[PDB]
Amino acid sequence: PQITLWQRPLVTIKIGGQLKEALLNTGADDTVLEEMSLPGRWKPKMIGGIGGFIKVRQYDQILIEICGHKAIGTVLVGPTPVNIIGRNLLTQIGCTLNF
Amino acid sequence: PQITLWQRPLVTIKIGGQLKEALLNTGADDTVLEEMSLPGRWKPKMIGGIGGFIKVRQYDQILIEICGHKAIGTVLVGPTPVNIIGRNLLTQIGCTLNF
Numbered sequence A, B: 001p002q003i004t005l006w007q008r009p010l011v012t013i014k015i016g017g018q019l020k021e022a023l024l025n026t027g028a029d030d031t032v033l034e035e036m037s038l039p040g041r042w043k044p045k046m047i048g049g050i051g052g053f054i055k056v057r058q059y060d061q062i063l064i065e066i067c068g069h070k071a072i073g074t075v076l077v078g079p080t081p082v083n084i085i086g087r088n089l090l091t092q093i094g095c096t097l098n099f
């Protein structure tokens, strides 16, 4: 679709067998999801935003469905206040900015 | 123009007579610029991000030129790690996410 920005650009995702809502976030290099149950290996990581830093777990080659579009990539899991789909996955679904 | 997301979507802005670079940020409701000198009056405001919160100064009705598109709106100024243009100004320049 084309999505305008008068509202938060929220979309439905499916990951780890679960349905969630997430914000399409061009301001985010990586994808960060709130605490959820994901299977498999992970790695400790620390990531920074506006107010400081958080600790997350890094899952690689995770299948995620974003507004119907499948992508496979790194997903970070941790105490983010909002589920964030970052450019690492946005490029995979062909998402662009336009004005 | 159309902007893809393989790299940070950075653009040139002009605000308060000064030239700066800023990230087009669909994940940001508001616009937040690093500490810079802006003319008139402002109001205290607290904003939350991934790792906590910061104090910013709220400037209303500020003229900003974003990649050659003029907009007038609220700009927050404070200790953000990156200049970020939020949806409040993105809607003004007609910016969309799409295909």
Ligand SMILES: COc1ccc(S(=O)(=O)N(CC(C)C)C[C@@H](O)[C@H](Cc2ccccc2)NC(=O)O[C@H]2CCO[C@H]3OC[C@H](O)[C@H]32)cc1
Residues within 6 Å of the ligand: A025, A026, A027, A028, A029, A030, A031, A032, A047, A048, A049, A050, A051, A081, A082, A084, A086, B025, B026, B027, B028, B029, B030, B031, B032, B047, B048, B049, B050, B080, B081, B082, B084, B086
């Ligand atoms: C009240 O108004 C506002 C409230 C919160 C924000 S917010 O904290 O900045 N923010 C609000 C969201 C949290 C809902 C927008 C989000 O896109 C932010 C802007 C930002 C901030 C600092 C540095 C780079 C980019 N992206 C974000 O925090 O990124 C993290 C997580 C994802 O991967 C990384 O890539 C950049 C950064 O280093 C990492 C902005 C405005």
